Amino acid sequence: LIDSKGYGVGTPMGSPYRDKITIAILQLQEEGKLHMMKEKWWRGNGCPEEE
Amino acid sequence: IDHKADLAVAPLAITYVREKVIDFSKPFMTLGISILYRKPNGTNPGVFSF
Amino acid sequence: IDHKADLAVAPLAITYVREKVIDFSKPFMTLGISILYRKPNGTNPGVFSF
Numbered sequence: 001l002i003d004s005k006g007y008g009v010g011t012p013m014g015s016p017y018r019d020k021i022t023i024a025i026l027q028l029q030e031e032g033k034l035h036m037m038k039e040k041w042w043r044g045n046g047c048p049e050e051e
Numbered sequence: 052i053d054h055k056a057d058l059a060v061a062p063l064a065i066t067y068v069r070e071k072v073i074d075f076s077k078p079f080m081t082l083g084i085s086i087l088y089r090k091p092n093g094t095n096p097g098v099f100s101f
Numbered sequence: 102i103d104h105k106a107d108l109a110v111a112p113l114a115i116t117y118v119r120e121k122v123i124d125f126s127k128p129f130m131t132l133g134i135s136i137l138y139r140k141p142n143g144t145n146p147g148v149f150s151f
């Protein structure tokens with residue numbers, strides 16, 4: 001990895017949601033629901049390392 | 052910016068030039084920049100490799 | 102909470118129950134919980150492996 005950054009649920013400048021979304025994001029991350037959603041879509045058809 | 056829609060639920064990365072104009076939330080994935088290069092075609096060792 | 106400080110620049114992890122009281126910045130370091138354990142020092146017997 002060249003750098004490190006991350007996605008976002010970006011709201012307008014001065015919105016009453018950039019706090020209500022991150023309490024909801026961290027609630028989905030402590031419960032592990034952001035990993036059941038990533039293993040669902042980034043699953044793939046499988047790929048061999050082979051050695 | 053001109054308040055036409057509220058959320059941006061899409062892979063919209065958190066950068067320095069974007070944070071000044073819109074409010075991102077805290078991340079839900081984590082990124083990096085990396086090279087997508089193509090794999091070689093193995094070596095294919097033959098059955099008469101001796 | 103009791104306003105005896107202004108920043109908390111520290112290894113202070115961003116959890117769900119901490120941001121309902123203090124109100125964090127946007128992360129300066131990526132991590133997760135992982136397991137520390139002794140490196141295995143002995144070697145496998147392998148009485149065969151000729």
Ligand SMILES: CCCCCCCC/C=C\CCCCCCCC(=O)O[C@@H](COC(=O)CCCCCCCCCCCCCCC)COP(=O)([O-])OCC[N+](C)(C)C
Nearest residue numbers: 048049050051090091092093094095096097098099100101
């Ligand atoms: C130092 C040890 C000395 C021992 C003696 C040595 C003597 C001479 C021995 C071998 C000489 C063979 C000629 C050289 C070939 C060069 C490479 C080649 O072209 O391979 C080709 C094989 O196609 C063949 O020609 C297979 C023939 C094997 C020889 C049979 C053994 C002789 C028996 C011994 C007599 C005892 C019986 C006694 C009474 C008669 C294939 O080309 P490739 O690019 O390599 O592979 C790609 C193909 N692939 C992916 C599909 C696999």
Ligand SMILES: O=S1(=O)NCN(C2CC2)c2ccc(F)cc21
Nearest residue numbers: 004005006078081127128129130
């Ligand atoms: O763009 S950020 O909000 N701040 C920068 N970083 C860490 C410094 C690597 C990270 C690391 C992981 C992220 F998901 C987000 C960010």
Ligand SMILES: C=C(C)[C@H]1CN[C@H](C(=O)O)[C@H]1CC(=O)O
Nearest residue numbers: 111112113114115116119134135
């Ligand atoms: C060593 C301590 C108490 C700290 C280190 N950072 C974690 C934190 O940010 O709360 C704590 C616990 C841990 O290592 O699991």
